[PDB]
From Swiss-Prot, chain B:
Membrane-crossing segments per the record: none
Source species: Xenopus laevis
Recorded superkingdom: Eukaryota
Name listed for the protein in its UniProt record: Gamma-tubulin complex component 3 homolog
Encoding gene per record: tubgcp3
Location of this chain's protein in the cell: Cytoplasm, Cytoskeleton, Microtubule organizing center, Centrosome
Family: Belongs to the TUBGCP family.
Coiled-coil spans in chain: none
Subunit-level organization: Interacts with gamma-tubulin.
Function: Necessary for the recruitment of gamma-tubulin to the centrosome and for the formation of a functional centrosome.
Disulfide bonds: none
Swiss-Prot record, chain C:
Function: Required for gamma-tubulin complex recruitment to the centrosome.
UniProt source species: Xenopus laevis
Annotated keywords: Cytoplasm, Cytoskeleton
UniProt GO cellular component terms: centrosome; cytoplasm; gamma-tubulin ring complex; interphase microtubule organizing center; spindle
Main location: cytoplasm
Cytoplasm is among the record's keywords: yes
Family recorded in the similarity comment: Belongs to the MOZART1 family.
Record-given protein name: Mitotic-spindle organizing protein 1
Gene (name only): mzt1
Subunit annotation: Part of the gamma-tubulin complex.
Range of the intact protein held here: 13 to 68 of 72
Domain of life of the source: Eukaryota
GO biological process, any: gamma-tubulin complex localization
Places the protein is found: Cytoplasm, Cytoskeleton, Microtubule organizing center, Centrosome; Cytoplasm, Cytoskeleton, Spindle
Amino acid sequence: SITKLFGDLCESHMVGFSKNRTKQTLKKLAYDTLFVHLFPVKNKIIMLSFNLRICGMSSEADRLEELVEYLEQHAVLELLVELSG
Amino acid sequence: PNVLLQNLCCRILGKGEADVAQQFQYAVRVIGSNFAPTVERDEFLVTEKIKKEFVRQRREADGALFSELHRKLQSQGVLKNRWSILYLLLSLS
Amino acid sequence: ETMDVLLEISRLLNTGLDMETLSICVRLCEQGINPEALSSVIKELRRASDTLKASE
Amino acid sequence: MSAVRETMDVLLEISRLLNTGLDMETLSICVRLCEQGINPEALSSVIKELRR
């Protein structure tokens, strides 16, 4: 269930740190942020590969393009792009 | 840069943003690999190459008109990279 | 395979996701959670975790 | 604003004399790319490929 997955996601952010209070604070924050937000990926990937090349990371850019083409040959890819850097 | 390059692809191909994705990635790659000009950045050397091209084509009247337009472009002071624009126009002639 | 490729992309993009957190995110997307909203949640959870670690 | 239009009109006349096949709006994109420091050699190669 979504409620379990957000619970597990909040616990992963508590690795390396009362515990129940912190878990409830992080859960509340996650839901409050999700609700505030509720109220093409290929082009973003091309822009990211270009940004890697201008930083001198051309091998990482070529590898990113290859891995994305392998996956094509969408919501998860859009999440990874929105979390880039 | 990137949005302008996507718009350039859409316009030349007569296609929407979704249909130009391959040509846009090609364009980004070519621009990213060629960050520095291999030629000297001299506006005068381009203006001389443009005038020589009109002479080569037997279009001496158009070479005189180009010299007037180049003087007007210089006096306006609006553009910073005048050399690069003239070089692009010469490269596409 | 597909999860390993997604983890390699995650590393190349420096997203800071590990295999466990990525596996939770994939299952949230499969349940119709918007990626842009989920990215915002992850960014806030990181910031709040680090603030709380600095306070303990 | 006036000086920018008058500058684009002069560039369009030079573009026509050179037979470059650029319209005003494509030329406006090219000028903005060059003013943003895009290499004109690389840009000319891209435009030639996109026309083919």
